[PDB]
Amino acid sequence: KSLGRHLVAEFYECDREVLDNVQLIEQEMKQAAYESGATIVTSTFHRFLPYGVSGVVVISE
Amino acid sequence: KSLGRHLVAEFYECDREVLDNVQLIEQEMKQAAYESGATIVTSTFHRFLPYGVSGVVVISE
Amino acid sequence: XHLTIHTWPEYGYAAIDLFTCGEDVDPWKAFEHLKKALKAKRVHVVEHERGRYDEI
Amino acid sequence: XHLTIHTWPEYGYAAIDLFTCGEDVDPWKAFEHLKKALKAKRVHVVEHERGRYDEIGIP
Ligand SMILES: *N[C@@H](CC[S@H](C)C[C@H]1O[C@@H](n2cnc3c(N)ncnc32)[C@H](O)[C@@H]1O)C(=O)OC
Ligand SMILES: *N[C@@H](CC[S@H](C)C[C@H]1O[C@@H](n2cnc3c(N)ncnc32)[C@H](O)[C@@H]1O)C(=O)OC
């Protein structure tokens, strides 16, 4: 019907320790990609200070 | 009002040559980051075959 | 395509985007895994159709 | 955060996301520059407020 499906999600009251763990986030984000059936092209994760994590996983079919 | 502002955009009837130019797209995306006043953290662009281009510019404040 | 995440530990908040293409890829499966991994207690999700066939 | 783009040259279509944080960062100039650079003749844009203060915990 459409070329892609896009979920815009807001997550509240998360495990704050998990949210500020750049390595864990990369692991989960990458498994999430696997779980969805997608093929990962590349991924880049960065950690902010005093806290915060940003990550992107580029995919394909 | 909120931590972030997010525009989800559909661009139609674009210059097809530009859309399939990974070099130009990276250039224009970084420039757009600049025009917005955002700080660039990282940038990664992929060229798909036979055609197609994916790219992401992770930014900050 | 992308699967992105931006966290605000100080607020227990995370902005997540799951953009997938293809009949054979399910963004809700990615969602389910992250909801579990982050232990989110409250979630709001909007599903967008990107590149509607009747539009392109 | 991120600025992202996924193009489908065969359809003259591009899926663009402009997600910025902070009052001093305007996602609309990124939009303005891209609409120009890609020469899009028609666009549809949805603006989301990510992490609303009243939803997380500011007030
Ligand atoms: N993250 C998206 C990526 C969308 S891509 C950029 C769309 C363009 O790429 C071409 N293409 C060629 N081969 C592929 C494969 N295997 N998957 C997707 N797109 C491909 C398209 O023809 C188009 O021009 C995503 O695919 O999410 C999973
Ligand atoms: N792309 C977003 C990035 C959102 S980040 C992941 C939010 C978290 O990062 C912390 N942080 C620390 N220093 C900064 C700066 N300079 N900018 C943004 N966020 C920062 C926050 O406290 C939070 O935990 C974006 O900022 O878009 C422009």
mmCIF file of C-alpha atoms and ligand atoms in Angstrom:
data_model
loop_
_atom_site.group_PDB
_atom_site.id
_atom_site.type_symbol
_atom_site.label_atom_id
_atom_site.label_comp_id
_atom_site.label_asym_id
_atom_site.label_seq_id
_atom_site.Cartn_x
_atom_site.Cartn_y
_atom_site.Cartn_z
ATOM 1 C CA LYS A 1 0.000 0.000 0.000
ATOM 2 C CA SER A 2 2.823 2.368 0.889
ATOM 3 C CA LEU A 3 6.534 1.929 0.400
ATOM 4 C CA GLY A 4 7.190 1.966 4.115
ATOM 5 C CA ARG A 5 5.614 1.721 7.546
ATOM 6 C CA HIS A 6 6.819 4.205 10.156
ATOM 7 C CA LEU A 7 6.263 4.038 13.909
ATOM 8 C CA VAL A 8 6.891 7.249 15.843
ATOM 9 C CA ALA A 9 7.030 6.197 19.472
ATOM 10 C CA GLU A 10 7.268 8.010 22.797
ATOM 11 C CA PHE A 11 8.630 5.873 25.671
ATOM 12 C CA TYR A 12 7.968 7.143 29.202
ATOM 13 C CA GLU A 13 9.239 6.060 32.613
ATOM 14 C CA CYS A 14 11.995 3.838 31.250
ATOM 15 C CA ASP A 15 14.847 2.261 33.198
ATOM 16 C CA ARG A 16 17.049 5.353 33.443
ATOM 17 C CA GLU A 17 20.198 3.274 33.912
ATOM 18 C CA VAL A 18 19.424 1.454 30.672
ATOM 19 C CA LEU A 19 18.696 4.757 28.898
ATOM 20 C CA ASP A 20 22.146 6.119 29.749
ATOM 21 C CA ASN A 21 24.021 2.993 28.661
ATOM 22 C CA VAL A 22 25.352 3.570 25.155
ATOM 23 C CA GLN A 23 26.606 0.006 24.707
ATOM 24 C CA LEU A 24 23.405 -1.689 25.824
ATOM 25 C CA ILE A 25 21.274 0.586 23.640
ATOM 26 C CA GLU A 26 23.381 -0.371 20.621
ATOM 27 C CA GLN A 27 22.893 -4.059 21.413
ATOM 28 C CA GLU A 28 19.123 -3.815 21.812
ATOM 29 C CA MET A 29 18.619 -1.486 18.847
ATOM 30 C CA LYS A 30 20.515 -3.936 16.679
ATOM 31 C CA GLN A 31 18.526 -6.957 18.026
ATOM 32 C CA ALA A 32 15.334 -4.973 17.429
ATOM 33 C CA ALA A 33 16.438 -4.684 13.803
ATOM 34 C CA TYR A 34 16.959 -8.440 13.630
ATOM 35 C CA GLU A 35 13.595 -9.104 15.295
ATOM 36 C CA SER A 36 11.865 -7.035 12.667
ATOM 37 C CA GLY A 37 13.251 -9.063 9.764
ATOM 38 C CA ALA A 38 15.338 -6.211 8.377
ATOM 39 C CA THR A 39 18.894 -6.330 7.087
ATOM 40 C CA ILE A 40 21.262 -3.915 8.828
ATOM 41 C CA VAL A 41 23.424 -1.765 6.561
ATOM 42 C CA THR A 42 25.267 0.193 9.236
ATOM 43 C CA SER A 43 24.740 1.643 12.711
ATOM 44 C CA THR A 44 26.150 4.569 14.639
ATOM 45 C CA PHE A 45 25.720 5.220 18.349
ATOM 46 C CA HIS A 46 26.899 8.198 20.374
ATOM 47 C CA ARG A 47 26.679 9.144 24.038
ATOM 48 C CA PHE A 48 26.083 12.639 25.390
ATOM 49 C CA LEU A 49 27.177 14.189 28.665
ATOM 50 C CA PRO A 50 26.331 14.406 31.468
ATOM 51 C CA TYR A 51 23.918 11.790 30.114
ATOM 52 C CA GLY A 52 21.904 10.718 27.094
ATOM 53 C CA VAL A 53 22.261 8.340 24.155
ATOM 54 C CA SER A 54 21.562 8.675 20.427
ATOM 55 C CA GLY A 55 21.624 5.801 17.982
ATOM 56 C CA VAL A 56 20.713 5.054 14.400
ATOM 57 C CA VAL A 57 20.447 1.754 12.560
ATOM 58 C CA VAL A 58 20.239 1.985 8.772
ATOM 59 C CA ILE A 59 18.345 -0.908 7.171
ATOM 60 C CA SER A 60 17.168 -2.438 3.888
ATOM 61 C CA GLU A 61 15.040 -5.390 2.690
ATOM 62 C CA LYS B 1 6.724 22.984 25.025
ATOM 63 C CA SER B 2 8.647 19.798 24.205
ATOM 64 C CA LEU B 3 12.181 18.399 24.117
ATOM 65 C CA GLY B 4 12.150 18.179 20.344
ATOM 66 C CA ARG B 5 10.374 19.177 17.142
ATOM 67 C CA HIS B 6 10.088 16.498 14.446
ATOM 68 C CA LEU B 7 8.955 17.011 10.851
ATOM 69 C CA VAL B 8 7.894 13.824 9.052
ATOM 70 C CA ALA B 9 7.967 14.846 5.390
ATOM 71 C CA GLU B 10 6.879 13.377 2.075
ATOM 72 C CA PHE B 11 8.680 14.979 -0.907
ATOM 73 C CA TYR B 12 7.040 14.365 -4.301
ATOM 74 C CA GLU B 13 8.063 15.032 -7.906
ATOM 75 C CA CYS B 14 11.709 15.690 -7.063
ATOM 76 C CA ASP B 15 14.621 15.988 -9.477
ATOM 77 C CA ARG B 16 15.234 12.265 -9.979
ATOM 78 C CA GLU B 17 18.900 12.749 -10.849
ATOM 79 C CA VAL B 18 19.467 14.523 -7.542
ATOM 80 C CA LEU B 19 17.655 11.752 -5.625
ATOM 81 C CA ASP B 20 20.064 9.130 -7.019
ATOM 82 C CA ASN B 21 23.242 11.151 -6.312
ATOM 83 C CA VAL B 22 24.698 10.001 -2.981
ATOM 84 C CA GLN B 23 27.421 12.687 -3.135
ATOM 85 C CA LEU B 24 24.999 15.576 -3.630
ATOM 86 C CA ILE B 25 22.533 14.255 -1.051
ATOM 87 C CA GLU B 26 25.156 14.087 1.691
ATOM 88 C CA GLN B 27 26.209 17.602 0.750
ATOM 89 C CA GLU B 28 22.662 18.972 0.868
ATOM 90 C CA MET B 29 21.801 17.147 4.104
ATOM 91 C CA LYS B 30 24.821 18.568 5.930
ATOM 92 C CA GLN B 31 23.936 22.013 4.601
ATOM 93 C CA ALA B 32 20.362 21.600 5.861
ATOM 94 C CA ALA B 33 21.769 20.690 9.275
ATOM 95 C CA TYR B 34 23.801 23.889 9.095
ATOM 96 C CA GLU B 35 20.817 26.035 8.052
ATOM 97 C CA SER B 36 18.852 24.715 11.033
ATOM 98 C CA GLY B 37 21.581 25.751 13.472
ATOM 99 C CA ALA B 38 22.153 22.183 14.616
ATOM 100 C CA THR B 39 25.558 20.729 15.478
ATOM 101 C CA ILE B 40 26.561 17.728 13.381
ATOM 102 C CA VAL B 41 27.654 14.704 15.386
ATOM 103 C CA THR B 42 27.969 12.175 12.704
ATOM 104 C CA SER B 43 26.972 11.414 9.092
ATOM 105 C CA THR B 44 26.527 8.242 7.078
ATOM 106 C CA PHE B 45 25.133 7.770 3.580
ATOM 107 C CA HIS B 46 24.535 4.596 1.575
ATOM 108 C CA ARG B 47 24.088 4.201 -2.194
ATOM 109 C CA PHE B 48 21.667 1.446 -3.240
ATOM 110 C CA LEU B 49 21.642 -0.389 -6.557
ATOM 111 C CA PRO B 50 20.255 -0.075 -9.154
ATOM 112 C CA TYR B 51 19.065 3.203 -7.626
ATOM 113 C CA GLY B 52 18.174 4.745 -4.279
ATOM 114 C CA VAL B 53 19.920 6.642 -1.487
ATOM 115 C CA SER B 54 19.734 6.420 2.317
ATOM 116 C CA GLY B 55 21.351 8.878 4.678
ATOM 117 C CA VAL B 56 21.407 10.127 8.227
ATOM 118 C CA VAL B 57 22.940 13.091 9.974
ATOM 119 C CA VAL B 58 22.916 12.641 13.735
ATOM 120 C CA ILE B 59 22.756 16.109 15.247
ATOM 121 C CA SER B 60 22.720 18.001 18.472
ATOM 122 C CA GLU B 61 22.064 21.326 20.046
ATOM 123 C CA UNK C 1 15.014 2.597 6.216
ATOM 124 C CA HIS C 2 16.140 3.494 9.722
ATOM 125 C CA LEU C 3 15.683 2.546 13.378
ATOM 126 C CA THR C 4 16.566 5.452 15.668
ATOM 127 C CA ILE C 5 16.646 6.206 19.378
ATOM 128 C CA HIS C 6 17.292 9.327 21.456
ATOM 129 C CA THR C 7 17.294 9.066 25.240
ATOM 130 C CA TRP C 8 16.803 11.584 28.039
ATOM 131 C CA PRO C 9 17.830 9.527 31.112
ATOM 132 C CA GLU C 10 17.129 12.539 33.336
ATOM 133 C CA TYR C 11 13.464 12.164 32.349
ATOM 134 C CA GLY C 12 13.211 8.415 31.790
ATOM 135 C CA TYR C 13 12.136 9.329 28.268
ATOM 136 C CA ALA C 14 13.096 7.912 24.881
ATOM 137 C CA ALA C 15 12.132 9.106 21.395
ATOM 138 C CA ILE C 16 12.087 6.037 19.145
ATOM 139 C CA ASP C 17 11.473 5.807 15.387
ATOM 140 C CA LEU C 18 10.928 2.543 13.521
ATOM 141 C CA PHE C 19 10.754 3.135 9.749
ATOM 142 C CA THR C 20 10.717 -0.067 7.676
ATOM 143 C CA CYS C 21 10.062 -1.004 4.041
ATOM 144 C CA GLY C 22 8.781 -4.240 2.606
ATOM 145 C CA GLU C 23 6.063 -6.664 3.309
ATOM 146 C CA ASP C 24 8.447 -8.794 4.899
ATOM 147 C CA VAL C 25 9.698 -6.496 7.589
ATOM 148 C CA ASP C 26 7.576 -5.718 10.678
ATOM 149 C CA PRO C 27 8.317 -2.556 12.686
ATOM 150 C CA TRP C 28 6.064 -3.717 15.524
ATOM 151 C CA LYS C 29 8.411 -6.547 16.257
ATOM 152 C CA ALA C 30 11.208 -3.981 16.753
ATOM 153 C CA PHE C 31 8.855 -2.024 19.019
ATOM 154 C CA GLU C 32 8.074 -5.067 21.164
ATOM 155 C CA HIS C 33 11.770 -5.825 21.743
ATOM 156 C CA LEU C 34 12.614 -2.257 22.761
ATOM 157 C CA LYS C 35 9.580 -1.884 25.012
ATOM 158 C CA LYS C 36 10.984 -4.917 26.843
ATOM 159 C CA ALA C 37 14.612 -3.801 26.811
ATOM 160 C CA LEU C 38 13.879 -0.289 28.089
ATOM 161 C CA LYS C 39 11.204 -1.338 30.565
ATOM 162 C CA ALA C 40 8.934 1.473 29.409
ATOM 163 C CA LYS C 41 5.908 1.913 31.578
ATOM 164 C CA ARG C 42 3.886 4.067 29.259
ATOM 165 C CA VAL C 43 4.058 4.304 25.502
ATOM 166 C CA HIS C 44 2.461 6.303 22.721
ATOM 167 C CA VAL C 45 2.882 5.174 19.130
ATOM 168 C CA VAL C 46 1.644 6.649 15.868
ATOM 169 C CA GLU C 47 1.936 4.650 12.660
ATOM 170 C CA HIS C 48 2.636 6.581 9.462
ATOM 171 C CA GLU C 49 2.410 5.326 5.899
ATOM 172 C CA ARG C 50 5.483 6.639 4.073
ATOM 173 C CA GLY C 51 5.226 6.881 0.290
ATOM 174 C CA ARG C 52 1.564 5.974 -0.212
ATOM 175 C CA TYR C 53 1.161 4.248 -3.573
ATOM 176 C CA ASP C 54 -1.835 6.431 -4.468
ATOM 177 C CA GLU C 55 0.398 9.440 -3.804
ATOM 178 C CA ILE C 56 3.597 8.574 -5.677
ATOM 179 C CA UNK D 1 18.540 14.324 17.094
ATOM 180 C CA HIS D 2 18.611 13.234 13.527
ATOM 181 C CA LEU D 3 18.092 14.416 9.898
ATOM 182 C CA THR D 4 17.276 11.469 7.634
ATOM 183 C CA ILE D 5 16.472 10.877 3.975
ATOM 184 C CA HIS D 6 15.493 7.816 1.943
ATOM 185 C CA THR D 7 15.041 8.316 -1.779
ATOM 186 C CA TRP D 8 13.163 6.369 -4.441
ATOM 187 C CA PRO D 9 14.520 7.997 -7.645
ATOM 188 C CA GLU D 10 12.276 5.748 -9.719
ATOM 189 C CA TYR D 11 9.255 7.490 -8.173
ATOM 190 C CA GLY D 12 10.688 10.978 -7.717
ATOM 191 C CA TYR D 13 9.881 10.435 -4.040
ATOM 192 C CA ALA D 14 11.874 11.134 -0.871
ATOM 193 C CA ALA D 15 11.024 10.313 2.749
ATOM 194 C CA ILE D 16 12.576 12.990 4.911
ATOM 195 C CA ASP D 17 12.662 13.303 8.704
ATOM 196 C CA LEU D 18 13.877 16.468 10.428
ATOM 197 C CA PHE D 19 14.094 15.881 14.184
ATOM 198 C CA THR D 20 15.728 18.721 16.147
ATOM 199 C CA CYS D 21 15.982 19.636 19.850
ATOM 200 C CA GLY D 22 16.187 23.057 21.456
ATOM 201 C CA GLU D 23 14.470 26.366 20.743
ATOM 202 C CA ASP D 24 17.535 27.646 18.883
ATOM 203 C CA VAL D 25 17.430 24.836 16.301
ATOM 204 C CA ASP D 26 14.756 25.229 13.595
ATOM 205 C CA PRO D 27 13.847 22.140 11.594
ATOM 206 C CA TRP D 28 11.979 24.303 9.112
ATOM 207 C CA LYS D 29 15.153 25.863 7.604
ATOM 208 C CA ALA D 30 16.456 22.286 7.047
ATOM 209 C CA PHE D 31 13.113 21.698 5.281
ATOM 210 C CA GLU D 32 13.436 24.892 3.259
ATOM 211 C CA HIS D 33 16.939 24.001 2.068
ATOM 212 C CA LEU D 34 15.982 20.428 1.084
ATOM 213 C CA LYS D 35 12.751 21.323 -0.730
ATOM 214 C CA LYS D 36 15.005 23.683 -2.819
ATOM 215 C CA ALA D 37 17.907 21.278 -3.352
ATOM 216 C CA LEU D 38 15.653 18.337 -4.355
ATOM 217 C CA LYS D 39 13.277 20.550 -6.322
ATOM 218 C CA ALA D 40 10.183 18.846 -4.871
ATOM 219 C CA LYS D 41 6.970 20.137 -6.516
ATOM 220 C CA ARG D 42 4.640 18.895 -3.854
ATOM 221 C CA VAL D 43 5.107 18.096 -0.138
ATOM 222 C CA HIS D 44 3.196 16.841 2.881
ATOM 223 C CA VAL D 45 4.567 17.501 6.357
ATOM 224 C CA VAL D 46 3.519 16.357 9.829
ATOM 225 C CA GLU D 47 5.002 18.150 12.836
ATOM 226 C CA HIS D 48 5.359 16.130 16.031
ATOM 227 C CA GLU D 49 6.298 17.472 19.454
ATOM 228 C CA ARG D 50 8.656 14.814 20.808
ATOM 229 C CA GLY D 51 8.897 14.550 24.588
ATOM 230 C CA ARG D 52 6.170 17.022 25.537
ATOM 231 C CA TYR D 53 6.952 18.663 28.867
ATOM 232 C CA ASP D 54 3.555 17.745 30.332
ATOM 233 C CA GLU D 55 3.997 14.086 29.319
ATOM 234 C CA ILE D 56 7.473 13.539 30.740
ATOM 235 C CA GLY D 57 7.618 15.659 33.882
ATOM 236 C CA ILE D 58 8.327 19.379 33.791
ATOM 237 C CA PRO D 59 5.315 21.088 35.415
HETATM 238 N N1 LIG E 1 15.555 2.114 5.115
HETATM 239 C C1 LIG E 1 14.876 1.815 3.882
HETATM 240 C C2 LIG E 1 15.812 2.091 2.725
HETATM 241 C C3 LIG E 1 15.015 2.704 1.550
HETATM 242 S S1 LIG E 1 15.915 2.761 0.143
HETATM 243 C C4 LIG E 1 16.828 3.959 0.250
HETATM 244 C C5 LIG E 1 14.868 2.942 -1.181
HETATM 245 C C6 LIG E 1 15.571 2.989 -2.541
HETATM 246 O O1 LIG E 1 16.572 1.928 -2.563
HETATM 247 C C7 LIG E 1 16.308 1.040 -3.643
HETATM 248 N N2 LIG E 1 16.681 -0.314 -3.212
HETATM 249 C C8 LIG E 1 17.510 -1.211 -3.847
HETATM 250 N N3 LIG E 1 17.658 -2.353 -3.208
HETATM 251 C C9 LIG E 1 16.871 -2.198 -2.078
HETATM 252 C C10 LIG E 1 16.581 -3.040 -0.956
HETATM 253 N N4 LIG E 1 17.079 -4.268 -0.808
HETATM 254 N N5 LIG E 1 15.736 -2.565 0.023
HETATM 255 C C11 LIG E 1 15.218 -1.320 -0.106
HETATM 256 N N6 LIG E 1 15.420 -0.442 -1.105
HETATM 257 C C12 LIG E 1 16.264 -0.944 -2.063
HETATM 258 C C13 LIG E 1 14.817 1.224 -3.965
HETATM 259 O O2 LIG E 1 14.485 0.761 -5.269
HETATM 260 C C14 LIG E 1 14.644 2.711 -3.731
HETATM 261 O O3 LIG E 1 15.100 3.435 -4.882
HETATM 262 C C15 LIG E 1 14.399 0.307 3.881
HETATM 263 O O4 LIG E 1 14.460 -0.375 2.807
HETATM 264 O O5 LIG E 1 13.921 -0.132 4.994
HETATM 265 C C16 LIG E 1 13.963 -1.426 5.259
HETATM 266 N N1 LIG E 2 19.396 14.484 18.092
HETATM 267 C C1 LIG E 2 19.063 15.043 19.389
HETATM 268 C C2 LIG E 2 19.934 14.409 20.435
HETATM 269 C C3 LIG E 2 19.090 14.105 21.689
HETATM 270 S S1 LIG E 2 20.059 13.608 22.951
HETATM 271 C C4 LIG E 2 20.245 12.123 22.804
HETATM 272 C C5 LIG E 2 19.290 13.962 24.422
HETATM 273 C C6 LIG E 2 20.109 13.564 25.649
HETATM 274 O O1 LIG E 2 21.448 14.113 25.481
HETATM 275 C C7 LIG E 2 21.756 14.971 26.564
HETATM 276 N N2 LIG E 2 22.594 16.048 26.051
HETATM 277 C C8 LIG E 2 23.796 16.489 26.546
HETATM 278 N N3 LIG E 2 24.329 17.479 25.863
HETATM 279 C C9 LIG E 2 23.413 17.705 24.848
HETATM 280 C C10 LIG E 2 23.366 18.627 23.759
HETATM 281 N N4 LIG E 2 24.326 19.527 23.517
HETATM 282 N N5 LIG E 2 22.277 18.586 22.908
HETATM 283 C C11 LIG E 2 21.296 17.678 23.136
HETATM 284 N N6 LIG E 2 21.234 16.763 24.123
HETATM 285 C C12 LIG E 2 22.331 16.831 24.951
HETATM 286 C C13 LIG E 2 20.406 15.419 27.125
HETATM 287 O O2 LIG E 2 20.533 15.928 28.444
HETATM 288 C C14 LIG E 2 19.590 14.141 26.968
HETATM 289 O O3 LIG E 2 19.891 13.224 28.030
HETATM 290 C C15 LIG E 2 19.232 16.648 19.386
HETATM 291 O O4 LIG E 2 19.705 17.238 20.419
HETATM 292 O O5 LIG E 2 18.801 17.274 18.323
HETATM 293 C C16 LIG E 2 19.322 18.448 17.977
#
